[PDB]
Amino acid sequence: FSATMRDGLSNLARRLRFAMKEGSIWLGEQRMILLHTAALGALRKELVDTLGMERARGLFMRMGFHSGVRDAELAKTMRSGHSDFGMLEMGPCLHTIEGVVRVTPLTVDINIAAGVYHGEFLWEDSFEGDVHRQMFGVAQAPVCWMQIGYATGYTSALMGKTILYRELECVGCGHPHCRILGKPLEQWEDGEAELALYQPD
Amino acid sequence: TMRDGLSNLARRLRFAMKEGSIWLGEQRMILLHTAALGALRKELVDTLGMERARGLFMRMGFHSGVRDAELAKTMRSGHSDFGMLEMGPCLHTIEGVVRVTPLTVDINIAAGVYHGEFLWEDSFEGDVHRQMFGVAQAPVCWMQIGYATGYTSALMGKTILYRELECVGCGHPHCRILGKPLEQWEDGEAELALYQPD
Ligand SMILES: [Zn+2]
Ligand SMILES: [Zn+2]
Numbered sequence: 001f002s003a004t005m006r007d008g009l010s011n012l013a014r015r016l017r018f019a020m021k022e023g024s025i026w027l028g029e030q031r032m033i034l035l036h037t038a039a040l041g042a043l044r045k046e047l048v049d050t051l052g053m054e055r056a057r058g059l060f061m062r063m064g065f066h067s068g069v070r071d072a073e074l075a076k077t078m079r080s081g082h083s084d085f086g087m088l089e090m091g092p093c094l095h096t097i098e099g100v101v102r103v104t105p106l107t108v109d110i111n112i113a114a115g116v117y118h119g120e121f122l123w124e125d126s127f128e129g130d131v132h133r134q135m136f137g138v139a140q141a142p143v144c145w146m147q148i149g150y151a152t153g154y155t156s157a158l159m160g161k162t163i164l165y166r167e168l169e170c171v172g173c174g175h176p177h178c179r180i181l182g183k184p185l186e187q188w189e190d191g192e193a194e195l196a197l198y199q200p201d
Numbered sequence: 202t203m204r205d206g207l208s209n210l211a212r213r214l215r216f217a218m219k220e221g222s223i224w225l226g227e228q229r230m231i232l233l234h235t236a237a238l239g240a241l242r243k244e245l246v247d248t249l250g251m252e253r254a255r256g257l258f259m260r261m262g263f264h265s266g267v268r269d270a271e272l273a274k275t276m277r278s279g280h281s282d283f284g285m286l287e288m289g290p291c292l293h294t295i296e297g298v299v300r301v302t303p304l305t306v307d308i309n310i311a312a313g314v315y316h317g318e319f320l321w322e323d324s325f326e327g328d329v330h331r332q333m334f335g336v337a338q339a340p341v342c343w344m345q346i347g348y349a350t351g352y353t354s355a356l357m358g359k360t361i362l363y364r365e366l367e368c369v370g371c372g373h374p375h376c377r378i379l380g381k382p383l384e385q386w387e388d389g390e391a392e393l394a395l396y397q398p399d
Contacts, residue, residue, distance in 0.1 A: 001219050009218060020207050023293070023300025023323055031235045033325055034214075034296040036228050039265040046257060046398055059244060066237040095221070098232035102221030125220050127231055200244055 002104075004086075008093035015074060016097065027098075028074035041131040048136070057145045058197050064149025065198055067098075071150075072157035084110045091154040092121065101126045101147055106179070110159075115184070117155065117163050123147065123178035129171035143172030148180065152198070155182055164194050202303075203284070206291040213272065214295065225292070226272035239329035246334075255343050256395050258326075262347025263396055269293075269348075270355035282308045289352040290319065299324045299345055299376070308357075313382070315353065315361050321345065321376035327369035336372045340365035346378065350396070353380055362392050 002009065017026045025032040047056040068091070075090040088110050092103035102124040109118040123144065132143040142148075148165050155163040165182040169175040185191045213226045223230045245254040266289070273288040286308050290301035302320035309315075326342040340346075346363050353361040363380035367373040383389040 018297070020211065020294055023295075023297060024325075025232070025297030027232065027234075031297070031325060032232045033235060033238070033298050034223070034225065034230045035233050035238075036225075036230055036265045036268055038228060038268055039261045040231070040233075042264045043257060043261045046260070050399065059241060062244070063237045063241045066240045067234045070234050070236055096218055097216070099216070099221060099223030099229070100231050102219070125222055127222070127229060130229075201248070 002096075005089060005093055005096070005103075008086075008090055009097060011078070012090070012093055012097055027094075028071075028077065030070050030074070032098075037127045037131050041135050044131065045135045060145035061149035061152070061197050062200065064146035064151075065153035066149075067146075068150035068153030068155070069157045072154045075154075075158065084112050087112075087158060088119070088155070091151065091158070094154075095147070095150060099127065100150070101128075101144070101178070112159055115159065115161055117159055117183060119155070119163075119165075119180075119182040121151070121180050121182075123180060126171055126178050129178060132172045138174050139170075139172045141173070142167030142170030142178070144170055144178055147178075149198070151180060151182055161185075162195065164188055164191055166194075203287045203291060206284075206287050207295065209276070210272075210288055210291050211295055213276075225269075225296075226275065228268050228272070230296075235325045235329050239333045242330065243333045253399070256399065258343035259347035259350070259395050260398060262344035262349075263351035264347075265344075266348035266351025266353070267355045270352045273352075273356060282310045285310070285356060286317070286353070289349065289356070292352075293345070293348060297325070298348070299326075299342070304377075310357055313357065313359055315357055315381060316385075317353065317380040319349070319378045319380075321365075321378060324369055324376050327376060330370045337368075337370045339371065340368035340376070341370035342368055342376055345376075347396070349378060349380055357382075360393060362386055362389060364392070 015028045071094045095101055095103050104122040106120040106122055126144045128144040128147050151165040162185040163182050164185055165180050168179050170178045215224050269292045293299055293301050300322040304318040304320055307316045324342050326345050330341040349363040360383040361380050363378050365376055365378050367377040369376055
């Protein structure tokens with residue numbers, strides 16, 4: 001049901017090592033845990049309840065940003081014999097293997113050497129959208145915060161420039177699926193202020 | 202010393218790529234980078250202080266533990282009370298959180314009997330805490346302790362609290378924990394209070 005993503009998914013699960021003789025999981029050179037979405041949901045609930053939705057959104061986008069940046073490093077380890085899109089597409093694949101979301105590239109214009117990027121993707125079965133509705137009910141703006149942070153971090157680390165993403169539709173809002181658009185910071189009218197969300201204090 | 206638990210619980214873990222999801226029993230899971238979780242921990246500790254951050258993580262672990270206990274209960278058939286208990290250590294291990302070795306475990310669910318001591322090796326939490334900070338002056342495997350507390354309390358049907366008696370986060374070569382009912386802990390109801398959202 002996927003292409004060319006298949007190759008990516010196969011070539012990636014081999015970088016995924018489950019070692020219950022040591023109680024660890026490694027993906028590439030990054031240690032991972034399996035975490036219940038319901039536990040991340042409970043954390044999110046307390047964060048929004050005591051910090052507010054905006055600051056909580058920031059914490060999650062940054063957490064996602066860190067994940068994406070690490071996965072881009074893994075992506076760059078197997079660049080040999082890989083087009084710019086083929087390297088880009090690893091993000092979508094890693095996002096799927098980690099059970100975060102089913103990603104389908106809709107159309108992608110990417111040139112790393114030239115600094116050109118324009119990407120739109122479909123997101124099916126976002127864990128974050130579902131978790132949010134269960135904790136909060138329907139939302140009045142897209143809620144896949146960690147997931148957007150990840151696309152932003154992964155793509156930016158890959159390009160060596162800031163690529164910001166925005167959800168144009170989201171299941172958290174009661175759509176059938178999520179859909180996103182990513183492009184250079186410069187090209188977003190209020191980009192500099194979105195950028196403020198990725199900084200800690 | 203169940204290897205039998207690992208192989209049998211690990212079969213409950215599946216990757217449904219076409220739906221971009223991972224299932225452990227009936228619970229959806231994600232693979233998350235410890236580095237990212239650690240970045241979150243540092244922000245929470247920096248902005249909300251350690252005691253408040255500690256509470257958030259214990260309660261997150263607690264929720265994980267309660268839900269793995271619900272999975273354990275489904276596989277109740279043909280298992281002793283000890284066998285049931287051991288699925289907790291096993292799931293924690295399978296989840297890549299920590300490698301758990303039961304040391305002495307005395308359990309009888311009907312009679313409300315529980316006293317459990319466990320060895321924790323390669324704790325991700327203690328590990329990440331001491332890289333994002335330094336050696337700490339008190340045990341720091343917050344989420345891991347929450348999980349044990351939640352798993353065992355759900356299995357026993359009564360409040361079972363755990364404490365770390367050693368922790369890699371404090372420069373010990375390993376973590377070690379003890380779990381027993383609330384009444385057996387000196388300041389137990391102040392420990393039970395960490396599990397109540399603020
Ligand atoms: Zn969404
Ligand atoms: Zn510890």
